[PDB]
Design a protein around this ligand. Structure first.
Ligand SMILES: CC(C)CCC[C@@H](C)[C@H]1CC[C@H]2[C@@H]3CC=C4C[C@@H](OC(=O)CCC(=O)O)CC[C@]4(C)[C@H]3CC[C@]12C
Ligand SMILES: CC(C)CCC[C@@H](C)[C@H]1CC[C@H]2[C@@H]3CC=C4C[C@@H](OC(=O)CCC(=O)O)CC[C@]4(C)[C@H]3CC[C@]12C
Ligand SMILES: CC(C)CCC[C@@H](C)[C@H]1CC[C@H]2[C@@H]3CC=C4C[C@@H](OC(=O)CCC(=O)O)CC[C@]4(C)[C@H]3CC[C@]12C
Ligand SMILES: N[C@@H](CC(=O)Nc1ccc(Oc2cc(F)c(F)cc2Br)cc1)C(=O)O
Ligand SMILES: N[C@@H](CC(=O)Nc1ccc(Oc2cc(F)c(F)cc2Br)cc1)C(=O)O
Ligand SMILES: N[C@@H](CC(=O)Nc1ccc(Oc2cc(F)c(F)cc2Br)cc1)C(=O)O
Ligand SMILES: CCCCCCCCCCCCO[C@@H]1O[C@H](CO)[C@@H](O)[C@H](O)[C@H]1O
Ligand SMILES: CCCCCCCCCCCCO[C@@H]1O[C@H](CO)[C@@H](O)[C@H](O)[C@H]1O
Ligand SMILES: CCCCCCCCCCCCO[C@@H]1O[C@H](CO)[C@@H](O)[C@H](O)[C@H]1O
Lengths: 424, 424, 424
């Protein structure tokens, strides 16, 4: 009977067993004498290997998936009803992401543990990288060294510049139409290969996460503050999800559609419960189809377009979670983030929540993308993974609720056009 | 009646209005107190963004346009005659570029404002870059540090190494014939995407150039010396164009063809006037067709090949202009150029005059390619653009004259072969 | 009668004449006064150009040949009999490689002329490069700077990380099947282009090698130690070949097949002699086919598969030679190699003995790949080429013997399957 439960989710059960084993081994080694830091380095080495493996692939993913999605997936044959959905998604997700950054900088869960103008000028300068091979590992930083300001070259990937340039590249390829089909197919092949590599690497994730946990449990001064930091991080994420799902999305539905959002929740309550249970938008998709069709009575076309694409492109709770987690790792490491990196994380949270289900088994890769877009030490992911089992259900329910409200909004903004088409 | 003039050339009129607005705003701010240099940095920021965009695009252009041109365009179905044109172009253009580099180093318009052996060895070393990913942003510089000479890695793109390697790459691809079509098409698609990006960016050029002008007017010591420097630069370009069009090209026609070049000039006078009026070789191409066909009576085939390809590959006046302008920017900044960078600019001027009309709206990109091949500060282009409205007509006229003399030379070097073919 | 000998091998005779001319000119200049080191730098400059050319081409070769071989060449239509061969090759070659590294570090031909744990951890870190554009020119090195260990970015190509990533990439390409054809063809075309470039550059090899030889002869202290160093290096290579082809391969045949290996030698004696005479596995291939078929009586299928692919993938003597030569250059320069670079050279020798005949005229490129994978000065190759005319015959003989024993081993490990197939 146990096999029928564990085997069907072998990767998840392996990761859970690895986390438990790493935590208990870390506790046992903590019960021992203060360990030689080289022995800790050997212990936490497979985690370093996993982090390096994933950070090796964070580059080809942003090179290829942006091009493939912008060129290939974006088809305007859906007409205005398509755009009314798309402009919704990239609008609500940011509202989520910024909200997280507002909350985590207000609560500062881990905090107890250059001017802003130059920071924003540096943000804009790194957003247009004057070189493209040097934007793969180097950003430009303004240094006042002591009144003549200059621009030196930092070390760290320039995620924003590459993302901007390849968004432009994908848009141009899409505008070429069919004459660029050869390169569209080439980059689609590269994307499939890189996703195969990500899946292949993530099978090694159990042992890497186990070693990361066993290397972080040993090297903390006292658990009495780390446990409180993690608890406040959970509190921040849950408060953000509540504020987004229960106050912001109903406010959008009220201001745009001007229909009672509480009736909408009464309709999609079954979908929300099924999203909490399944913890997957794709699995919950039939339930939300049934709810929005037979309960709210919205048009079949608007649902049939919005829901299948909103379940993979519109995830709000994941964006808020990733923003809060990146800022929490920044604060817990003592790294205070300026106004040029807060916007960087608040944009990479969006651009990594877009691809957190469009690319299977890429949550860790997206978290590392966010943590390396702001130059942070990417070794504290272990604390996130040790707790990223209760938040997943809530942040999936928030995504499903966001998709439902997107379907409602798009239907209410295109009812006249659909009626006119159906009349003929 | 005004829209019939401004509307047709919307980009040109936008750039002119931007330049005028930037100049008048700079004058007004100059009438104010010495401004905080940070306020100047904010003022001159959109120009910085434009230069960063263009310098971002200078890499894929030399990666892809060289491949597309050498592999795709070069087809020897034209036979010996085709070579008799090509070896002409890449010769006379150089005769232009070097000439400019001489004149600007004899007049030194902006000057008042390591041994050469090691410099040439450094030129040859950077011509064969031992690494290709490190040649995208780093050149090798010889340092005597104090008798044991060594080689360190400077900062700045290695334009010569990339150009040489990809000339070899394109030549090999062309020698593969049809078996390499699947990558010829890939690089052609990439070239079209990059050209679309250049056009898209150059629509932002008005605001960037306006801000560059308004940030350069404020931050100069006195307008007198700058105006004199610009006047001397324009005089140098005029002298170079006169010496090339009126003395060098007739000398080539005399030494090779041994026919009176003044009769040729009398014949192509109409084409020269129409080139001055139109300021475009492509628009003057029908006029030079008619002139060279019904006035000089050269063969139809030699004209039909040379002129359509010479109007886009053979521009000598543009090469002389670009060499003189790059050296003038070097002299204004006080950057004295050694014998390893003078050859660099005198080669990049040729390789940019080749692609200054094969790629629409890529003149600024070519100027930045030349200014970054020799490690110069790319912020003085505004001074060039302030005066680059009277030199355009004259350099276009010189290009058209060069194409006409190339047609004459090629016809006189293939009359026997054409006669033998026509006899059968 | 002389042209019938020199003309057929024009590249080989050109290289020999260049070596002789460079050596005699170096001797004559040695008879002169101590020369200005700048004159020596000028003399040894074409050799520097050749080294830079080849080191420029070592990157696209490992980018493209790995993909082309792992994806394209590896076809499992040969069934298990294929794997029984392949697992043999990559296991014999390593034995050939490591053995060389054992002898050269034991004999240290040129020697008279960070802990190991951190070295191996640095090996593993450089084998998983956290960045893929920074892995093209930079490795990570552990520095104890003075108890808090850190990781700083060294300078030098990260050959191992790129090889590992692109082995993974090619394996994924091959596993994804026929949907990757549009990119397999792209990389095959790129590989053929780069092979054409390697052949084109290697035609310039005579003059570069002559200048390298002259520059080395001019700039060494005394021949009394250099001649002894080269003699000991040749003795080490010969000892390694004798041990591998006389003690190790017969031991493998005895332990696996349990048949008298001396009878196997008696069977392939003609093949061994023809391999020594021809100094080429491909030319000897008909002779070893005839010997193994009509003398040992092994199955036609096993021979017809193993020999044609073993002649181009299984060269053991070349791996031993390259490992010994790289370590000999390391010792002769006074560069002591740690345990993290000994494994690097012992793996790059294996991965460059595969591509030492799969890519014609790429022996120098493979030697430079090995010498730059361990951060060595690539100017001592001339002293290898001065003696690399007697060792070629012996290493070719060892390669042919290895292929013959591979055929024997694979036949004895698949006799039952072949008999069962033939019975039906
Ligand atoms: C901070 C929050 C609580 C209030 C502010 C949120 C607004 C900035 C965003 C959230 C949802 C967005 C709406 C999502 C959908 C649309 C449809 C879209 O209009 C169209 O698609 C027209 C059709 C077409 O583009 O062709 C843009 C306006 C609007 C109302 C957006 C307006 C801006 C909105 C209200
Ligand atoms: C500094 C200037 C004023 C005088 C020196 C200029 C010469 C170095 C260049 C200028 C034009 C060149 C000529 C342009 C055209 C040709 C045809 C070309 O010959 C062929 O094309 C033969 C056919 C073939 O290549 O198959 C090369 C020689 C020649 C006379 C070139 C010889 C070298 C010339 C005279
Ligand atoms: C240091 C040397 C002198 C002794 C140790 C050498 C062994 C480590 C290597 C050398 C040759 C290798 C053998 C080469 C061929 C094979 C066949 C191969 O088995 C198969 O191919 C099964 C079919 C399949 O793979 O599906 C792996 C075992 C074996 C005996 C290898 C076992 C390991 C061997 C003996
Ligand atoms: N599940 C929903 C939305 C969704 O994808 N949630 C999600 C996101 C990332 C992820 O990976 C991570 C990320 C971490 F930051 C971490 F610390 C640990 C892991 Br594991 C796993 C799940 C759906 O797709 O419907
Ligand atoms: N016009 C002729 C030849 C031709 O192309 N002329 C040309 C060249 C570059 C250019 O761009 C620039 C370049 C600058 F250095 C600058 F300071 C400002 C600008 Br704008 C504009 C025109 C033809 O093609 O027939
Ligand atoms: N010959 C056999 C095996 C084979 O390839 N041998 C071989 C390998 C490399 C090579 O190139 C080099 C390498 C040097 F280290 C050098 F110093 C000089 C040169 Br040249 C030349 C020959 C076969 O293929 O059957
Ligand atoms: C104090 C806590 C004690 C108990 C610790 C339990 C720790 C359980 C850790 C489970 C991690 C869940 O993360 C999942 O990882 C999967 C694969 O990596 C993804 O497929 C999935 O999407 C994602 O949700
Ligand atoms: C002292 C001076 C006072 C008056 C200032 C007038 C300033 C006018 C400046 C015009 C610039 C012309 O440049 C053109 O740019 C176009 C697009 O960038 C290209 O399409 C074209 O090829 C190229 O010629
Ligand atoms: C003390 C010594 C005095 C006499 C010096 C003689 C020096 C001869 C040097 C021969 C070099 C042989 O190397 C060959 O190079 C070819 C092309 O590079 C490859 O095609 C071939 O594969 C490879 O074997």
């Amino acid at each position: 009977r146990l096999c029928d439960k564990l085997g069907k989710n072998l990767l998840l059960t392996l990761t859970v067993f690895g986390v438990i084993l790493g935590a208990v081994c870390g506790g046992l080694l903590r019960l021992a004498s203060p360990i030689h830091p080289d022995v800790v380095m050997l212990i936490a080495f497979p985690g370093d290997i996993l982090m390096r493996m994933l950070k090796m692939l964070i580059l080809p993913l942003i090179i290829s998936s942006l091009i493939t999605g912008l060129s290939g997936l974006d088809a305007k044959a859906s007409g205005r009803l398509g755009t009314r959905a798309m402009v919704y998604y990239m609008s609500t997700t940011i509202i989520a992401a910024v909200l997280g950054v507002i909350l985590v900088l207000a609560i500062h869960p881990g905090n107890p543990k250059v001017s802003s103008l130059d920071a924003f000028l540096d943000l804009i300068r790194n957003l247009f990288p004057e070189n493209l091979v040097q934007a793969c590992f180097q950003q430009i930083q303004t240094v006042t060294k002591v009144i003549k300001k200059g621009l030196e070259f930092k070390d760290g990937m320039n995620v924003l510049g590459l993302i901007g340039f390849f968004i432009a590249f994908g848009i141009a390829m899409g505008k070429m139409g069919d004459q660029a089909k050869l390169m569209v197919d080439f980059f689609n092949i590269l994307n499939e290969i890189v996703m195969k590599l990500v899946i292949m690497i993530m099978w090694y994730s159990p042992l890497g996460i186990a070693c990361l946990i066993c290397g972080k449990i040993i090297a903390i001064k006292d658990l009495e503050v780390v446990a409180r930091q993690l608890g406040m991080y959970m509190v921040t994420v849950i408060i953000g999800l509540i504020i987004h799902g229960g106050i912001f999305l109903p406010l959008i539905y009220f201001v745009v559609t001007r229909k009672n959002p509480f009736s909408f929740f009464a309709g999609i309550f079954q979908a929300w419960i099924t999203a909490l249970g399944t913890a997957s938008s794709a699995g919950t998709l039939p339930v939300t189809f049934r709810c929005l069709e037979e309960n709210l009575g919205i048009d079949k076309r608007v649902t049939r377009f919005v829901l299948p694409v909103g379940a993979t492109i519109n995830m709000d709770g994941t964006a808020l979670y990733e923003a809060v987690a990146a800022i929490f790792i920044a604060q817990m490491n003592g790294v205070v983030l300026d106004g040029g990196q807060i916007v960087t994380v608040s944009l990479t949270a969006t651009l990594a929540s877009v691809g957190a289900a469009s690319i299977p088994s890429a949550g860790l890769v997206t978290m590392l993308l966010i943590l390396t877009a702001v130059g942070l030490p990417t070794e504290d992911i272990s604390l996130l993974v040790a707790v990223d089992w209760l938040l997943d259900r809530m942040r999936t329910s928030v995504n499903v609720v966001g998709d439902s409200f997107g379907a409602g909004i798009v239907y209410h903004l295109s009812k006249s056009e659909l009626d006119t088409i159906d009349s003929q």
